[PDB]
Design a protein around this ligand. Structure first.
Ligand SMILES: [Cl-]
Ligand SMILES: [Cl-]
Length: 129
């Protein structure tokens, strides 16, 4: 499923994420835009053999099991394919553990490079929230 901007904002604002660990909702919508272009089915292979999955491009070396990343940790205790569902619940719950592990949203390279220090509130502007 390819979410609309305000549609995703609302679903994220329905699942715990507005100001979770101090990150306003505009940060999360910005990160989803540049990580996945709002597409729940996005996958990308990395050079170390791991793969990033879903709306927030969660990585298989640490967070989910795709059965083909040797020596991975499955810290969210899910198969990576659950991160591709149209229901974003699994993605949001895993993202909550990632952002809580000490490094905040810097875990997401596109957030660091394209959202951090920008006017992230513009990403929820005009939405009925
Ligand atoms: Cl915001
Ligand atoms: Cl932080």
């Amino acid at each position: 499923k390819v979410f609309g901007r305000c549609e995703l904002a609302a679903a994220m604002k329905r699942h715990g994420l507005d100001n979770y660990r101090g990150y306003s909702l505009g940060n999360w919508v910005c990160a989803a835009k540049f990580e996945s272009n709002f597409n729940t089915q996005a996958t990308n292979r990395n050079t170390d053999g791991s793969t990033d999955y879903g709306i927030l491009q969660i990585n298989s070396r640490w967070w989910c099991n795709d059965g083909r990343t040797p020596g991975s940790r499955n810290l969210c205790n899910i198969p990576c394919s659950a991160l591709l569902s149209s229901d974003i619940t699994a993605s949001v719950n895993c993202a909550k553990k990632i952002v809580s592990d000490g490094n905040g949203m810097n875990a997401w390279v596109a957030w660091r490079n394209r959202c951090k220090g920008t006017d992230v509130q513009a990403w929820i502007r005009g939405c009925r929230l």
